[PDB]
Ligand binder design. Structure first.
Ligand SMILES: Nc1ncnc2c1ncn2[C@@H]1O[C@H](COP(=O)(O)OP(=O)(O)OP(O)(O)=S)[C@@H](O)[C@H]1O
Lengths: 910, 49, 790
C-alpha cells in the first residue's frame, strides 16, 4: 500500500490537481510518507534531477498550492518533521534555505527583479509562505517596492518612447545617446540596488537621464507617440536642420521646442476655430471617411493640456467631415461632367454650375457653403469608391465608340460570346477574357445601352442607383472594364476572322482517340534503335497523313495537360484516355527495347499497329513467310497491359534461357549479345562478312571461310531437319485451337524459346553457333598455358594492391612468367573504366570459371576499383552466384587495384 | 567581388574540374585552353591600343 | 576588357533612345508636372538626355562605384548636366517612369533594385543584348521578370509607353546541375520557332535561364554552347532572321565572367540598413496612418535582421523573411486598429523567423527591442493553425497583396502526416499529392497528372499537402514566389512542365503545405527553395505536452508488462515482446495512440477527470489490437488477475473481435463523430476473402451494405486500374457503401509498400468524387502470419 499510494501521489502530482485540501490524516507515519511522496514526486525534474539554481525552485514554490499547505502543517507540529525520510527532509531543507535566502534579500534591495515580478504576480501565496517563515513588516514593504517597480517600468517606457521618437529621424540628424545606448539595450537580469532610491526624495537609476528636462520630455513624447499630427510636425521641423552627430541637451532646443511651439499654437487655434482651410486640407488629407481614429486622435490631442473635451471634439469633426464630403462632391461633379461629355449625351443638368464656380474660388475661414448643402443632397451617398468606375468609363472612349459601332444592342451579346469562345485561345487568361468582357458589358449595359441622348438629372441618378446595385455584386468590375478595354485589337479581329486553322490542343486528342494508329517499327535504316525512333503515331484524314514523333507527343501532352477548366466529363475523360493509352504504349516501347537490347532475334523484325479506336484492336505482324497475321479487337488499355505482362514474362524466360545457354558453352561467352546476333546472321551466308572473320580470328587464328564452312557443315545432323519440319507441321493445327491472341502468342513464344531455328531459316541457333565455335577452336590447336607466380593461389581470387602508377607494369610482369607464349587478347583482361557495362565483367566471370576450356589461363581484372557502386555490387553478386552454382576449382583470377582508393566497394568487401 | 556577388560559387576552387595549370578558368579574363606547342614560339602581339 | 566593344554596342543603344526620343520627353514632362514641383519642369534636349541614358545603361548600372563615375563624367557635359545630382535625379525619374508604365501593384517596394532591374532588362531586350542578373533571394529579379511579362505586351499594354514598344513572349528553362546542352539547344530552336513567321519590329521572344548559376561546372558542360546561341542564333547552319533571341539570365549564384562578358553584369549587392528601411517604407506605403504608427519598428527589425543574417554561416535566412515580417505586422496593425501588442510582434517573428536549430531569433529580435518581451509560452500548434486557417477578414478587401507564404514542416521518418490529419485539418480534407509507388509506372506521366491535380486544386481552392518536391521543384517554382498577375481581379501564377509555361487561376483561399525530411532539406535542397517556403518544426515533441509524455511513458511500460507473462503450463522459455502481443508495435506507437486518445476525448483540459479517462481509453485502443491468445494468457501475466479479468471482459463484451462481419454489424449501427467517411484498417491472421464471402456478406447485410467490392493489389500494375475500379464503385447507387481492400504480405511478390499509395489514392478519390448524401466505410484488410511476419 505504501508503493501504490506513492505511485498514486506521483500520478496526481504529475497532473496539476492539488492533492491535500481535505485530509484529516492524524496517523503521522503514513502522513509523513505521503509528505515525502509529494516532495520527491512533485519536484521539478528536467530529465531527472538537475536543479542547481534558485529561480525554478522559487517559481515551483509560488505556483503549486500544496507546498504552502506542506510547510504550514509541518511547521504546525515537530512530531511530523521527525518522521519523513532522509531525502525528503534534505529537499525541504534546500527549498527552505532557498526561500530564506531570497526573501531575506528583500530586506535590502539586492533582490533580483525577476523574483520581484514573480512575487507581485503571486501576492497571496508569497504572503502565506512568508507568514509561515515568520514563525521560523511585509505589507508596506511590498507596496513600497511595488511603487518603485512601477516607477521603473514607466521610466523604461519613457526612455524607450524617446529612443523610438529619435529613431524615426535617424537618417537626418544622428544623436549620441550619452551612456543610454548600452544601458537600454541590456536585459533586466540586473541588480535592483543599482536603482538608487536615495534620500535628501529623488530616485536616480542606471539610465542616467541628464536632467529632469529630458525626463519630462520623454513623458510628453510617451503621451504623444500615437498622435499622427505630432509626428508630422516632428518630421517637418526636423527636416529644418539640413549629417550632424549631435548631443542630447541641444536636441531639446534645436528640434523639440519649435515643434512644441507649432503644436501649441495649432492647439490654441483649434480650440477657437480660427484656422483657415489651407492647413485643414494640407494636414488632414489622409483621414477621409475614417473618423473614429480622428475622434480618438482629438481625445489624445487634448490630453496634452489637461482640461475637458465637451464642446470641442464633435462639432469640429463634423465640420471637417462636411469639408471632406464637399471636396468629394467637387471631384464627383468633375468626373460626372467628364462622363456626360465623353458619352456624347448633351442633356441638361443646370444644377452643378455654382459648385464648379466655387471650385476655382478661394476663401479663408473655418466656418460652415450653406447654399451648396441642398445641392450636395443630390450627391450624399455615392462613396469614396465608385467614382473610379465613372473615371474608367469617362477615360475609355475608344471602346464605347467601338461598342456603338460594332454591336449596337444587348441582344447580339449571346451570339457574340459564343463566337468569341471559339476564337479565344486555350490557356486560362485567353478563355477568361470572354467572361471578363461579358461581366463588364452586362454591368455597364444600364448606361451604354439604355441612355437617350437627352436625359434629365433625376432619371440619370435613377439609373446610377441600379448601376450601383449591379456594382454591389462585383467589386472587380471597373478592372474588368479596363481589362476588356485593353483587348480592343482582339475584339476587332474576332468578327472578321476567317478560318483560323489551329485545331486545338484538345480536339487533337479527340482526333488521336478517333483514328490514331500507334506504330512500333524498330526501323531498318541506318539510325540507332533509341526509344524515340521506334515509336510513331499517324493521323489520316482528303487523304493526307500526319506523323507524330515521341517528343511532339510529349509537347502536346504538356499543352493539353494545362488547359482551362471546362467542367464537363468528356474533356477530362478523353485527355485521361489519351494520356493513359500513351503511357501504356510507352511502357510497351520500354519492354520491347529491353527485349531488343537483351538480344532476341525473334522480335528484330517485329511491328505492331495499335489502333486507339473504340473497339479498334491491335494488328501485329512478323517478317516471316511461315507465320500469319495476329489480330484481336477489344478495348486498348487492359489488352496492352496484358500484352506487356506476357512480354515481360518472355523477357524473364529469355534471360533465364540465355543464362543457361551461356553456362553450357564456353566459346559463346567471348562475345556479347549484339555480336552473337551479328555472328548468327553472318555465318549462314556462303561468304561471311570480313568483320565477322576478323572477330572470329581471336578463337581459331588465321580464320578462313573454308575452315568456317567446314566447321558449320558438320555441326548439325539430319534429325534436326525432321524436328524443324515437325515444328512446321504441328503449329498450324495448334494456333487454331485458341481463338484469342494471348494463348497463341504464349504458344509461339514457348516454341521460339525451345526450338528457335525453325522460325528463322536464315540464322544459326546458339547450339549450332556454340558447336561451330568449339569445332573451330578444336581445329586450331596448341593452347596457351600460364602459371601463377610464387605466393599466388591458383584456386582463389588474388586481390593485389599495386598503386596507380604500377598496375599496368605489374600485369605484364604477371603475364611474362611464361616465355614464348602469345600476347593476350580481348579475353582474360579488362581494362576497367568508369561507366563500364555489367555485361563485359559478367562475361569475364563466365570466361574464367567455365569447365570446357582445354587450358589454364591467367584472367585479369585491371583497375577494378574504377567500377561504380551498382556495377561492382552486381559483379559481387554474380561472382557469388556462379561460385555457388558450378565451376572448376583451378581458375586463376587476378585482381589489380589502386592502393590509394580503398574506400570503394569491390576491394573492401574482398 | 565575385565570391561576394550574392550567394557564393556552387563549387569551390579545389574541386573545380576545368583547370589550366593550378588555376581554374573561372578566374581568368578569357576562358581559353592551353596553346599546344609549336604555336607558343609563333605568336606575336599587336599594339596595346 | 570590353574596350572598343562596348562603344559599338552602346552607340546602337544611343540610336535606339534617339529614334524613340519623341514621346519619352512628353511622358517625363507629364510625370514631373503631375507628381513634382516646377524645379523639374525645364526643357530637355532630345539628344543630350539620350546620351545620359546611353551612358546610364552601358556603364553606370554595372558599377558599384557609381558616385565616382558620376563625378568623373559630369565635367564633359554642357550646362544642364554640370552636376552629378542632375544625372542622379534624371536616371531616377526615368526609372520611376518605367516602373509607372508597369501595372499598378500594392505592397511592393519602390526600391532602387526593382526599378534598376526592370530598366536594364527592358532596354536590353529591345536591343537583343543579353542580361546576366545575379544576386541573392530578395533582390527582386523574378518579380521584375513577371512585371515585364504583364507590362510590355504589344498592343495590350497598361500604359501608352509600352504600347509603342515591342511584344514579349518568354520561355523559361530552370537549369539544373544535371542539364544537357540539348535542352538549351531545344529551347533556343523553340523560341526561334515562335519568332518565325512574325513581324520582327513588333515581336521578340526571350529565353530566361532562371537558375543558370547551377550548371556552370557540370561535367557535361552545358553552358559552353551558349556563346554562339547569343550571337548567330544557332549552330551548324547559316545565320538568318528569326534566330537571334534576347536573354535575361537571372541567377541566384555568382557566374563565370569570361564567357558572360558579352552582356551586362548587373551584379547586385548586399543590402545595407538604408536600403532595408527604404524597402520597409515601400512595403508599407500603401497606407499612411498605420505606416506612421509602425514606422518606429523598422530600424530595430533591420538591425535584428542584420545580426541574424551575419550570425549564421550558412545562408539559411534571406530578405524574403524580413519582407514577410514587415507585411505581417502591417496586416496585423491594419486589422487591429489600436497599435501593436507585443504578443503580435512575438507571434510574427516566431512564425516568420524559424526553422534553424541553432538560432534563437526571438531572443535576438528582443535584444534590440526590450519592450516586446513576452513571458508566456507559445507553441507550434497555434502557429500552424494561424498559418493554415487564417482569419475571415484576411484577403477579403480590394485585391490581395498581403498574405503569408507556403508552409513547410520539418520532420524525420514521416511523422507529419499523422499529426496533420489528426489535429489541424478540420471540415474539408486536403488532396495529398504524393509519389505513387505502383510498379512500372512512368514518372513523367505521374508528374504531369500531379501538376494537373495541383492546378485543379488551385482553381477549386483547396489545400495541397505535397510529399515530394525533388520531382516538382523545377515545375512549381513560380507559384511558390507568391506573386500574382491580375486580369479582372483573378490571380495568375505560372505553371510549367519542361518548356511550356502558362498561367493558371488561383482562388482566394488556397494553401500549400510541403512535407520533407530534415536531412534532405538540410543537405539536398539547393537553398532558394528554403527562402520561398515558411519553415516550421512539428515532428513529435512540440504538440506533445509533458502530461501526455508521462502518459506515453506509462503506456510503454504498461504494454511491456502486458507482453510479460510467466507460466508453467508449457515447459518452454519464450519471451514475448510487445511486438508479438500488440501486432505492429515498433516502440513509437504509444505516442500515436495517445494522440488518437486525446482527440477522441475532445475537451482538452486537466481537471484530473480527463487524465484517467484518456489513459483508460488509450489502454482500450492498445487492447483493441491484441491477439486473443494473449488476452487469455493475461491471467498469468504481470498485470494481475482482476485487471486481466476486466481487460478480457473489455475485449470480449465491449469490442467485437469475433469476425469481420460481426465487426460490420457493430460498426454501422452507431452514429459516428460527425464524419461522412469512416476509415479502419484491419490486421488478419486468416486467409483473405475469396469472392463468395462478399456475396454472403451482402446476403446478411441486405439492409445496410451496398454490395461491397474486394480489390487485390496483385492485379493492379497501373494506377488507372485502381482508379477506374474505385470510380466505378463510387458511381453505383445506394448509400452506406462498404469497401474492402485486401493485400497479402507473406508470398513472393513485392507489393508490401503499395499499401500507403493505395490508402492515399483512396483518400484522394473519396475527396474528389463523393457527394454530400452517401456514407462511405472503407476497410483495409491485410494478411499476416504468426511465424515472424507479424
Ligand atoms: N521590392 C522588392 N524587392 C525584393 N523582394 C520583394 C520586393 N517586393 C516584394 N518582395 C518579395 O520577394 C518575393 C518575390 O521576389 P523574389 O522572389 O525575392 O525575387 P528574387 O529575390 O530575385 O528571387 P530569385 O532570385 O528569382 S530565386 C516575394 O516573397 C515578395 O513578397
Amino acid at each position: 500500500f505504501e508503493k501504490c499510494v506513492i505511485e498514486a501521489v506521483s500520478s496526481a502530482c504529475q497532473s496539476q490537481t492539488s492533492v491535500l485540501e481535505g485530509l484529516s490524516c492524524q496517523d503521522l507515519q503514513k502522513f509523513g510518507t505521503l509528505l515525502s511522496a509529494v516532495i520527491t514526486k512533485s519536484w521539478p525534474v528536467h530529465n531527472g534531477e538537475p536543479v542547481f539554481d534558485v529561480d525554478e525552485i522559487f517559481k515551483y514554490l509560488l505556483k503549486w498550492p500544496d507546498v504552502r499547505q506542506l510547510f504550514e502543517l509541518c511547521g504546525t507540529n515537530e512530531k511530523i518533521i521527525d518522521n519523513i525520510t532522509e531525502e525528503g527532509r534534505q529537499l525541504m531543507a534546500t527549498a527552505e534555505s532557498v526561500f530564506q535566502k531570497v526573501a531575506g534579500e528583500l530586506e535590502n534591495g539586492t533582490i533580483v527583479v525577476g523574483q520581484l515580478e514573480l512575487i507581485l504576480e503571486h501576492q497571496s501565496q508569497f504572503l502565506d509562505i512568508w507568514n509561515l517563515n515568520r514563525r521560523r513588516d511585509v505589507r508596506s514593504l511590498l507596496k513600497r517596492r511595488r511603487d518603485d517597480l512601477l516607477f521603473l517600468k514607466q521610466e523604461k517606457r519613457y526612455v524607450e518612447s524617446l529612443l523610438r521618437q529619435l529613431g524615426r529621424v535617424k537618417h537626418l540628424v544622428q544623436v549620441d545617446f550619452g551612456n543610454i545606448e548600452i544601458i537600454h539595450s541590456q536585459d533586466l537580469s540586473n541588480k535592483k540596488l543599482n536603482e538608487a532610491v536615495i534620500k535628501l526624495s529623488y530616485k536616480r537609476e542606471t539610465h542616467y537621464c541628464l536632467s529632469p528636462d529630458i525626463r519630462e520630455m520623454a513623458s510628453k513624447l510617451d503621451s504623444l507617440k500615437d498622435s499622427h499630427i505630432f509626428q508630422d510636425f516632428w518630421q517637418e521641423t526636423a527636416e529644418s536642420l539640413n549629417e550632424l552627430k549631435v548631443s542630447l541637451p541641444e536636441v531639446l532646443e534645436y528640434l523639440y521646442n519649435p515643434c512644441y511651439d507649432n503644436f501649441y499654437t495649432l492647439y490654441e487655434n483649434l480650440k477657437s476655430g480660427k484656422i483657415t482651410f489651407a492647413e485643414v486640407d494640407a494636414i488632414f488629407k489622409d483621414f477621409v471617411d475614417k473618423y473614429d481614429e480622428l475622434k480618438n486622435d482629438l481625445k489624445f490631442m487634448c490630453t496634452m493640456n489637461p482640461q475637458d473635451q465637451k464642446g470641442w471634439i464633435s462639432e469640429r469633426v463634423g465640420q471637417i467631415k462636411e469639408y471632406h464630403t464637399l471636396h468629394q462632391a467637387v471631384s464627383s461633379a468633375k468626373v460626372i461632367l467628364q462622363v456626360r461629355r465623353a458619352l456624347g449625351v448633351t442633356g441638361d443638368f443646370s444644377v452643378l454650375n455654382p459648385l464648379l464656380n466655387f471650385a476655382d474660388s478661394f476663401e479663408d475661414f473655418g466656418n460652415e457653403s450653406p447654399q451648396f448643402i441642398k445641392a450636395k443632397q443630390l450627391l450624399q451617398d455615392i462613396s469614396e469608391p465608385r467614382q473610379r468606375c465613372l473615371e474608367e468609363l469617362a477615360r475609355q472612349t475608344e471602346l464605347v465608340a467601338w461598342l456603338h459601332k460594332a454591336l449596337e444592342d444587348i441582344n447580339e451579346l449571346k451570339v457574340f460570346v459564343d463566337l468569341a469562345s471559339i476564337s479565344a485561345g486555350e490557356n486560362d487568361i485567353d478563355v477568361d477574357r470572354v467572361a471578363c468582357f461579358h461581366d463588364a458589358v452586362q454591368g455597364y449595359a444600364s448606361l451604354l445601352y439604355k441612355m437617350d441622348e437627352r436625359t434629365n438629372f433625376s432619371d440619370f441618378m435613377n439609373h446610377l442607383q441600379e448601376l450601383w446595385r449591379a456594382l454591389d455584386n462585383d467589386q472587380h468590375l471597373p478592372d474588368k472594364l479596363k481589362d476588356s478595354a485593353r483587348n480592343l485589337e482582339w475584339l476587332k479581329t474576332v468578327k472578321e476572322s476567317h478560318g483560323s486553322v489551329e485545331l486545338s490542343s484538345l480536339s487533337l486528342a479527340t482526333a488521336i482517340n478517333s483514328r490514331g494508329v500507334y506504330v512500333i517499327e524498330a526501323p531498318k535504316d541506318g539510325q540507332k534503335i533509341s526509344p524515340d525512333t521506334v515509336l510513331r503515331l499517324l493521323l489520316p484524314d482528303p487523304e493526307a497523313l500526319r506523323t507524330y514523333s515521341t517528343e511532339e507527343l510529349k509537347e502536346l501532352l504538356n499543352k493539353l495537360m494545362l488547359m482551362s477548366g471546362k467542367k464537363d466529363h468528356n474533356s477530362n475523360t478523353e485527355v485521361e484516355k489519351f494520356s493513359e493509352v500513351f503511357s501504356n504504349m510507352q511502357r510497351l516501347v520500354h519492354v520491347f527495347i529491353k527485349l531488343h537490347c537483351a538480344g532476341n532475334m525473334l522480335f528484330r523484325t517485329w511491328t505492331a499497329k495499335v489502333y486507339c479506336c473504340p473497339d479498334g484492336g491491335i494488328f501485329m505482324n512478323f517478317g516471316l513467310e511461315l507465320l500469319s497475321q495476329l489480330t484481336e479487337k477489344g478495348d486498348v488499355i487492359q489488352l496492352l497491359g496484358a500484352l506487356c505482362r506476357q512480354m515481360e514474362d518472355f523477357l524473364d524466360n529469355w534471360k533465364t534461357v540465355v543464362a543457361q545457354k551461356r553456362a553450357e558453352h564456353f566459346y559463346l561467352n567471348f562475345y556479347t549479345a549484339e555480336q552473337l546476333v551479328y555472328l548468327s546472321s553472318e555465318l549462314r551466308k556462303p561468304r561471311p562478312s570480313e568483320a565477322a572473320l576478323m572477330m572470329l580470328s581471336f578463337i581459331k587464328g588465321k580464320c578462313t571461310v573454308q575452315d568456317l564452312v567446314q566447321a558449320t557443315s558438320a555441326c548439325e545432323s539430319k534429325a534436326d531437319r525432321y524436328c524443324l519440319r515437325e515444328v512446321m507441321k504441328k503449329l498450324p493445327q495448334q494456333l487454331l485451337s485458341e481463338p484469342s491472341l494471348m494463348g497463341k502468342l504464349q504458344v509461339i513464344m514457348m516454341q521460339s524459346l525451345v526450338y528457335m531455328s525453325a522460325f528463322l531459316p536464315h540464322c544459326l541457333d546458339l547450339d549450332a553457333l556454340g558447336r561451330c565455335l568449339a569445332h573451330l577452336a578444336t581445329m586450331g590447336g596448341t593452347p596457351v598455358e600460364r602459371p601463377l607466380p610464387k605466393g599466388l593461389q591458383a584456386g582463389q581470387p588474388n586481390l593485389i594492391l599495386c598503386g596507380h602508377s604500377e598496375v599496368l607494369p605489374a600485369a605484364l610482369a604477371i603475364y611474362m612468367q611464361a616465355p614464348r607464349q602469345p600476347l593476350p587478347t580481348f579475353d582474360e583482361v579488362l581494362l576497367c573504366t568508369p561507366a563500364t557495362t555489367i555485361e563485359e565483367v559478367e562475361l569475364l566471370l563466365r570466361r574464367c570459371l567455365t569447365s570446357g576450356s582445354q587450358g589454364h589461363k591467367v584472367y585479369s581484372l585491371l583497375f577494378a576499383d574504377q567500377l561504380s557502386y551498382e556495377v561492382g555490387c552486381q559483379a559481387e553478386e554474380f561472382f557469388q552466384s556462379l561460385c555457388t552454382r558450378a565451376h572448376r576449382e583451378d581458375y586463376q583470377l587476378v585482381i589489380l587495384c589502386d592502393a590509394a582508393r580503398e574506400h570503394c566497394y569491390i576491394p573492401s568487401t574482398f | 567581388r565575385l565570391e561576394s556577388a550574392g550567394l557564393g560559387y556552387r563549387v569551390s576552387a579545389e574541386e573545380t574540374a576545368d583547370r589550366l595549370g593550378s588555376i581554374p578558368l573561372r578566374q581568368l579574363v578569357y576562358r581559353v585552353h592551353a596553346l599546344p606547342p609549336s604555336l607558343i614560339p609563333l605568336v606575336w602581339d599587336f599594339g596595346q591600343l | 576588357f570590353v574596350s572598343l566593344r562596348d562603344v559599338e554596342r552602346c552607340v546602337k543603344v544611343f540610336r535606339w533612345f534617339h529614334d524613340h526620343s519623341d514621346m519619352l520627353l512628353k511622358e517625363l514632362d507629364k510625370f514631373l508636372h503631375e507628381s513634382s514641383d516646377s524645379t523639374h519642369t525645364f526643357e530637355r534636349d532630345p539628344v543630350l538626355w539620350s546620351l545620359v541614358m546611353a551612358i546610364g545603361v552601358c556603364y553606370h548600372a554595372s558599377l558599384e562605384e557609381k558616385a565616382s563615375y558620376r563625378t568623373a563624367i559630369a565635367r564633359c557635359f554642357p550646362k544642364p548636366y554640370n552636376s552629378s545630382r542632375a544625372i542622379l535625379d534624371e536616371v531616377t525619374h526615368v526609372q520611376d517612369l518605367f516602373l509607372r508604365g508597369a501595372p499598378i501593384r500594392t505592397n511592393i517596394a519602390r526600391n532602387l533594385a526593382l526599378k534598376e532591374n526592370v530598366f536594364m532588362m527592358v532596354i536590353c531586350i529591345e536591343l537583343k543584348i543579353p542580361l546576366f542578373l545575379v544576386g541573392k533571394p530578395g533582390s527582386s529579379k523574378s518579380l521584375a521578370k513577371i512585371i515585364v511579362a504583364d507590362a510590355m505586351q504589344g498592343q495590350a499594354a497598361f500604359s501608352e509607353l509600352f504600347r509603342c514598344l515591342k511584344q514579349v513572349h518568354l520561355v523559361s528553362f530552370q537549369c539544373s546541375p544535371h542539364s544537357t546542352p540539348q535542352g538549351i539547344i531545344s529551347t533556343f530552336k523553340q523560341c526561334a520557332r515562335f519568332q518565325q513567321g512574325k513581324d520582327l519590329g513588333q515581336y521578340v521572344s526571350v529565353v530566361v535561364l532562371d537558375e543558370v548559376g547551377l550548371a556552370e561546372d557540370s561535367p557535361k558542360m552545358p553552358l559552353k554552347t551558349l556563346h554562339p546561341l547569343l550571337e548567330d542564333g544557332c549552330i551548324e547552319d547559316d545565320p538568318a532572321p528569326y534566330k537571334k533571341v534576347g536573354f535575361v539570365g537571372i541567377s541566384n549564384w555568382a557566374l563565370d565572367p569570361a564567357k558572360m562578358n558579352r552582356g551586362i553584369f548587373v551584379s547586385r549587392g548586399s543590402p545595407n540598413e538604408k536600403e532595408l528601411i527604404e524597402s520597409a517604407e515601400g512595403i508599407c506605403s500603401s497606407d499612411r496612418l498605420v505606416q506612421d504608427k509602425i514606422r518606429g519598428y523598422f530600424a530595430p527589425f533591420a538591425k535584428a535582421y542584420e545580426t541574424v543574417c551575419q550570425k549564421q554561416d550558412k545562408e539559411f535566412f534571406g530578405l524574403r523573411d524580413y519582407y514577410s515580417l514587415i507585411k505581417m505586422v502591417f496586416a496585423k496593425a491594419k486589422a487591429s486598429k489600436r497599435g501593436l501588442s507585443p504578443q503580435d510582434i512575438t507571434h510574427a517573428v516566431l512564425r516568420n523567423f524559424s526553422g534553424k536549430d541553432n538560432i534563437q531569433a526571438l531572443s535576438i529580435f528582443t535584444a534590440s527591442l526590450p519592450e516586446a518581451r513576452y513571458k508566456e509560452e507559445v507553441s507550434t500548434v497555434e502557429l500552424i493553425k494561424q498559418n493554415i486557417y487564417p482569419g475571415p477578414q484576411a484577403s477579403s478587401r480590394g485585391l490581395d497583396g498581403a498574405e503569408s507564404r507556403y508552409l513547410l514542416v520539418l520532420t524525420r521518418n514521416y511523422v507529419a502526416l499523422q499529426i496533420l490529419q489528426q489535429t489541424f485539418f478540420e471540415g474539408q480534407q486536403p488532396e495529398i499529392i504524393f509519389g505513387s509507388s505502383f510498379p512500372q509506372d512512368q514518372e513523367y506521366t505521374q508528374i504531369c497528372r500531379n501538376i494537373n491535380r495541383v492546378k485543379i486544386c488551385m482553381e477549386t481552392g483547396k489545400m495541397v499537402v505535397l510529399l515530394n518536391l525533388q520531382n516538382l521543384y523545377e515545375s512549381l517554382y513560380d507559384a511558390l514566389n507568391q506573386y500574382y498577375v491580375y486580369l479582372g481581379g483573378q490571380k495568375y501564377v505560372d505553371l510549367g512542365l519542361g518548356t511550356h509555361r502558362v498561367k493558371c487561376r488561383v482562388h482566394t483561399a488556397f494553401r500549400l503545405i510541403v512535407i520533407e525530411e530534415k536531412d534532405v532539406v538540410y543537405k539536398q535542397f539547393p537553398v532558394p527553395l528554403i527562402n520561398r517556403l515558411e519553415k516550421h518544426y512539428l515532428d513529435m515533441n512540440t504538440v506533445l505536452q509533458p502530461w501526455q509524455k508521462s502518459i506515453v511513458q506509462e503506456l510503454q511500460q504498461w504494454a511491456h508488462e502486458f507482453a510479460d507473462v510467466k507460466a508453467d503450463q508449457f515447459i518452454a522459455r519464450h519471451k514475448y515482446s510487445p511486438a508479438d502481443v500488440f501486432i505492429g508495435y515498433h516502440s513509437d506507437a504509444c505516442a500515436s495512440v495517445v494522440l488518437q486518445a486525446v482527440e477522441r476525448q475532445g475537451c482538452r483540459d486537466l481537471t484530473e477527470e480527463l487524465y484517467r479517462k484518456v489513459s483508460e481509453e488509450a489502454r482500450s485502443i492498445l487492447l483493441d489490437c491484441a491477439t486473443p491468445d494473449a488476452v487469455v494468457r493475461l491471467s498469468g501475466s504481470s498485470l494481475g488477475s482482476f485487471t486481466a479479468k476486466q481487460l478480457s471482459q473489455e475485449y470480449y463484451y465491449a469490442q467485437q473481435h469475433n469476425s469481420f462481419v460481426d465487426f460490420l454489424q457493430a460498426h454501422l449501427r452507431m452514429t459516428h463523430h460527425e464524419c461522412r467517411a469512416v476509415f479502419t484498417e484491419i490486421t488478419t491472421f486468416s486467409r483473405l476473402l475469396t469472392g463468395n464471402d462478399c456475396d454472403v456478406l451482402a446476403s446478411e447485410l441486405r439492409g445496410l451494405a451496398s454490395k461491397p467490392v474486394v480489390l487485390s493489389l496483385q492485379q493492379y500494375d497501373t494506377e488507372y486500374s485502381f482508379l477506374k475500379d474505385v470510380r466505378s464503385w463510387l458511381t453505383n447507387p445506394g448509400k452506406r457503401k462498404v469497401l474492402v481492400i485486401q493485400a497479402d504480405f507473406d508470398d513472393g511478390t513485392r507489393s508490401a509498400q503499395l499499401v500507403a499509395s493505395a490508402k492515399y489514392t483512396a483518400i484522394n478519390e473519396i475527396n474528389k468524387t463523393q457527394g454530400t448524401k452517401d456514407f462511405v466505410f472503407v476497410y483495409f484488410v491485410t494478411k499476416l502470419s504468426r511465424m515472424g511476419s507479424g
